Write a protein that binds this ligand. Structure first.
Ligand code: HEM
Length: 339
């Protein structure tokens, strides 16, 4: 509790995941089919859906839809394992090998494939939940406990165990350049990330909200979350944000539900902290959130949560097959053709 204010007394409760002692890693896989029309993605999305039901499949998996650049959409699965060896065995399963790593994607194909697989060391991971909710990413399969370590600037860092001994910094005084345009269509590309990047999934869940809370969330809060994410996508150098996606979650059948989340990679957790604490875009969000809590008596069915991880280069595998150049990590760092 290095950053906790003196006599800290949070006003709102919060919960955080408490991992069992035999758990050393969480595998968080984002797998995306990229298309201009969802009909072209239908066949791929069927094969992958069945693969998640294998005995070696993820402990939990969400679907989400992302509207990306230039009319291209990403149909994404967000899949979790609590054992890397089980995930490795799922990949090697022959049904998965039919489509893994864009194997079905030709160089003249109308769809793209991408995957960003992060193997998260547990001491480099933390979660926060506005309520005792068992349907928030890892809280589907990991118990959560009440925490006082929240509601101050630095609490995220303090909730992450390794920050007791590590600064988690990126190189001093250096920034992301302007994004570079790659010739990524028709190619199988691999990107190598630097050490200590920070990945956040921060989520909004209003499916249990009544008439009043839903109108206030859609009308007041969501517009500024969108503005936040748009700003982040367009100001990589200034913010340190490598990649930011606002996605809307879907049923197994792909119908949109009243849930969204932002998935962002940052050059370091300090970059994420500086944006969150000092930028007006989020200051705005936090301000329309308290203005919504003032319109409904600070009694909320809205549910928020986030998962934050700090990754070494070798913890994350970034593969883009026949993808648009602005996808994910493609505009930054070292790209390599896969043979
Ligand atoms: C691009 C979207 C967002 C990003 C990247 C983001 C990021 C963060 C981060 C990193 C923190 C922890 C800061 C720290 O502990 O030092 C935080 C805290 C917080 N955020 Fe956001 N957030 C986003 C959207 C939202 C939304 C949509 C809401 C509410 C509707 C929100 C409300 C809050 C609140 C209330 C806290 C305080 C949590 C606590 O009790 O510690 N944020 N956010």
């Amino acid at each position: 509790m290095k950053n906790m204010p003196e006599n800290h007394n949070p006003q709102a409760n919060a919960w955080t995941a408490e991992f069992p002692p035999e758990m050393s890693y969480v595998v968080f896989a984002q797998i995306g089919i990229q298309s201009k029309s969802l009909d072209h993605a239908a066949e791929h999305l069927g094969m992958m859906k069945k693969s998640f039901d294998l005995r070696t499949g993820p402990k939990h998996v969400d679907r989400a839809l992302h509207q990306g650049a230039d009319g291209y959409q990403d149909s994404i699965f967000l899949a979790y394992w609590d054992e890397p060896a089980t995930f490795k065995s799922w990949v090697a399963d022959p049904e998965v090998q039919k489509w893994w790593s864009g194997k079905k994607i030709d160089e003249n194909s109308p769809i793209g494939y991408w995957s960003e697989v992060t193997t998260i060391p547990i001491d480099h991971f933390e979660t926060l939940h506005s309520g005792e909710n068992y349907d928030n990413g890892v809280s589907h399969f990991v118990p959560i406990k009440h925490t006082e370590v929240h509601e101050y600037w630095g609490a995220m860092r303090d909730r992450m165990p390794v920050s007791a001994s590590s600064d988690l910094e990126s190189p001093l005084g250096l920034q992301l350049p302007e994004p570079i345009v790659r010739e990524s269509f028709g190619k199988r590309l691999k990107v190598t990330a630097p050490d200590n990047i920070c990945l956040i999934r921060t989520a909004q869940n209003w499916s249990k909200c009544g008439s009043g809370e839903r109108e206030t969330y859609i009308g007041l809060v969501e517009p500024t979350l969108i503005k936040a994410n748009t700003f982040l996508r367009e100001n990589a150098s200034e913010t340190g944000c490598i990649s930011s996606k606002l996605v809307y979650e879907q049923t197994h059948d792909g119908e949109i539900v009243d849930k969204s989340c932002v998935i962002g990679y940052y050059l370091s957790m300090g970059h994420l902290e500086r944006w969150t604490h000092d930028h007006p875009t989020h200051k705005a969000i936090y301000g329309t959130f308290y203005e919504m809590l003032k319109r409904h008596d600070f009694k909320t069915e809205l549910a928020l949560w986030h998962e934050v991880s700090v990754l070494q280069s070798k913890d994350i595998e970034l593969i883009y097959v026949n993808c648009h150049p602005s996808t994910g990590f493609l505009p930054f760092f070292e790209v390599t053709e896969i043979q």
